Amino acid sequence: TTGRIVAVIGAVVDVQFDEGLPPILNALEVQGRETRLVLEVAQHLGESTVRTIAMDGTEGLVRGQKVLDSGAPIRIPVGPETLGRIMNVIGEPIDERGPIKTKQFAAIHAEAPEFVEMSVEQEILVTGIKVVDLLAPYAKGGKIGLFGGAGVGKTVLIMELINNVAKAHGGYSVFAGVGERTREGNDLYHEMIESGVINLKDATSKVALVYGQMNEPPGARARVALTGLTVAEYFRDQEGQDVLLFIDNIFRFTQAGSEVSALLGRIPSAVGYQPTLATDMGTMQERITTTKKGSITSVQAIYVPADDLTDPAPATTFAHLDATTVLSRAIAELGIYPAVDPLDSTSRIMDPNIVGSEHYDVARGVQKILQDYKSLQDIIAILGMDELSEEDKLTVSRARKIQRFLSQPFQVAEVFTGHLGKLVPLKETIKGFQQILAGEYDHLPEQAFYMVGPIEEAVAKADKLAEEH
Amino acid sequence: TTGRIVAVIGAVVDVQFDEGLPPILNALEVQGRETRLVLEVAQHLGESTVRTIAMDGTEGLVRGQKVLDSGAPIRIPVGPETLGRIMNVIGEPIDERGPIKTKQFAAIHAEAPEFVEMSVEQEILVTGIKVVDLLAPYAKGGKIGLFGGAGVGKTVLIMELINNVAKAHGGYSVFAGVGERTREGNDLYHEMIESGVINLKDATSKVALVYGQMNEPPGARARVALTGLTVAEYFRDQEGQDVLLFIDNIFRFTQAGSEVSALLGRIPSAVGYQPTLATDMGTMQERITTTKKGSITSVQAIYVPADDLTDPAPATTFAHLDATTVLSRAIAELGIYPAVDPLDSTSRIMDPNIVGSEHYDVARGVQKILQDYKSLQDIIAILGMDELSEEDKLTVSRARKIQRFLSQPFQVAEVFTGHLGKLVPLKETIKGFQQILAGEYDHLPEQAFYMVGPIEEAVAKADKLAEEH
Amino acid sequence: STTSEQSARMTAMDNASKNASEMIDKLTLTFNRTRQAVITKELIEIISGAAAL
């Protein structure tokens, strides 16, 4: 059915249909365009007219320009053909490698899995990172979040998880470039070909790709997150297998909504955000989860504006997550990388019944001394280290060594650090921090524990520091 | 052609013409009134109707009152006859000395000088004040800006510069009373007659007065800044003379705009200001400049609302200035006058090429030790001077002596202060502070440096204190 | 010597707490002024937003 454009202001477009009025969340094919300009319905205004949002630039659009109704939402390719291929928000490919001819398609909009469909299987996932696996370990078949401010190491952290976990994972993966730098998309695409997870000449690709980035409009950036998970929903539902879902950055979903919230006709909420924040996030977030049939293990990078965790966009996301990784600038500026907050990052699986009493006691033991270290820092500001007692001096010594041993050089960040990357096992992490708390490395200096893999390398590095000195 | 007043709300008045609708900026004479009421055309609302801004009070206006069109903006007298005469916003004489007879008239509105017409020669201007000439020295044919809160010392500072520079300078002068005290207009008028710069009988006056004070409505205060501006343009362009413009206060232009923008039918900006803040100021400020033919050295007093420099009105003005003079309350309340902030006030001519390397190194040296003194205030607050290091005691001791030596008795301030004013040359200032930084006057007390001219009088004041014991 | 330093440290730390108390009192006022202004300013954003619809 035909419908002519009546108004165009910014990304928002109004189309008046003569009789056959389309439902909400339906794709609208705009005729008389060189590139495919698709519109999606948001509101019914009245008088057989509907308000829409543009999945691309609106320049060139004329009033009275015909726009046909598809009779369905934004339908995209889903299947094995999507693997090793980048695509738009609308579904078309963008890597100059022909059309992605899948045998079956799927709409980006769909109802979330019901309460009865929910799983309750808490199984530990051994990543490789020490600060993660010890304090806030990720659950296999669970929702993982990576909070952080401007330039604290969210991309470097998530790219390491792709490098470590996806290779070991005998299955599939889906990367989602939501509202971030297109330069990063260029970096990620080519380096995955070098590793061999995306093969060019043959169809044995592990990682599927969906992109949008901050060059695109808000309407695009609002829906790429939904476009990304829909590909992973195929690998969950139809193919009875596990799947990973790396998203970066999921703040840009919530940001992109507020960019067109005023033009849709809404009274703005607190901190200049849209009123529909909890619901718009909720309908999207709860789709990204493990059902009884399949299992999505999602990893979401979350941008924190102005390092403010109390801001609506990061704050509301905490409820949707099982495991969290709260990054800090204060920890990053010292030199600790990954700058993971040991007194903030938590996980649901952190329980003596789940992970064992040895894991729980050592993990909490690290969190005990690091919290008590903050109290001593207030005393040191007035006195100094000299006036403190013998017991308090040792607590700081053990605390500062624990801070540095939590740091670790990544394989993805070789050019940044300089040193080669590491990957520590489970019990090597448990036994490493247990020896430091017990007092087995009081004689060694704190510099030896800075940027190393297991506890053995700290003792091995102390041999070099001794001979150099 | 005749026009009818359809609506009147405060300063804003709407006029409906049948045919021959007047363009924007054109003045409109309101008929059936005792004093000459003027309405400048702001907008075209549509349906043969225009929105206007009233230069005088809008009381007594009946709906359907006849309004004529002059066919041009608010035209005012300009020439040698405007010297020693007081004008108002609409060019009329408000000194009760007949009409200002001139052979040419100028409109208050005009476009700024083009890129080709701009000048490049920035020569230094010697004020006499110590804190100014050392840290943020003014330029001949530039744009000086005196920032300050409520009662810090702007009118004292501007009258000092009028006393020093404008008296001893072979060229014309202009003063613009934009939204300040009418009492100050009375004081300035009789002071200038007493001095000689204004002459009642002889036609050899230097200063040209324009006044639209805080007793006037917003329409006057919005446009009276431009009225005084246009007088300086005549002397710059058509004659080619060195002009001295003195606007007190420039904030009142922007404040007047904030009052009308509500009634003009606009969406309010940040802190309730008009959305056209930068552009309205931009068209105004850009006219005040040194062209190829003539020259203007504008000294503008700038008000700071609630002692907040981040406020839109004082914030936007910074870009328009060559030299800044940020007056602080914290400095004033300590007793230091003039209360110019040495870690805030800056100038463009502060450069090793222009002033000299001896000037530059001493200037930054004063700023360094003051910055070190300010950093240690938290330590002195809790712990005290005893807990500081012995080298830091010398750093703090000199800084307070430098703070006090930056103070200076004023010429205009003699009437209430009692102490005689000072006028320190450029060479003596740099020589004086350089001795204190190196440490040639460490043995002398701090109160010796408080309120003195050159460094020689500071040492002489210390001997007077030694005699009293 | 030992009796002199303890008497001095008592009065020195007494001054340190009292000087800190004065800073707390004045910062509490500046906090509450800024607290009210943030509530007022952010409310005006929402009222201005609703007006333009």
Binding site: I382, L383, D386, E387 | L383, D386, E387 | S1, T2, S4, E5, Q6, A8, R9, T11, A12, M13
Partner: peptide, 22 residues
């Protein structure tokens, strides 16, 4: 004495010496 934060005692001792305790 060694422990600081006690007025100007350490400097007061140094006053008479020029003209124990680390």
């Amino acid at each position: 004495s060694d422990r600081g934060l006690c007025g100007a005692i350490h400097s007061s001792v140094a006053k008479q010496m020029k003209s124990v305790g680390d």
